[PDB]
Amino acid sequence: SQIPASEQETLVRPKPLLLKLLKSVGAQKDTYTMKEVLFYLGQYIMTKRLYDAAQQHIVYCSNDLLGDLFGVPSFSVKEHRKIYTMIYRNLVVVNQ
């Protein structure tokens, strides 16, 4: 397996619940880069209006597909490493 050119270019296969979330906002494929997963997660949060309207780094997701995948009722976008580890639990790394 070749090392990805950057972390953003890591190729991944979302597990079934994350895949369901991605398809709900229009994703069509089974394999994605990490960058693509992050863009689709952002789009999910905006289209479902999950962010606090006044303090927009706070996301509320209790019992949403997203809260079920992350295991939390809310989180801060500023917690970069916590968000990455929550995402990583929901996918498998693949070749290329």
Partner: peptide
């Protein structure tokens, strides 16, 4: 700051 600008700092 917009949620879109906060999230853009992840990737």
């Amino acid at each position: 700051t917009s949620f879109x600008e906060y999230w853009x700092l992840l990737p």
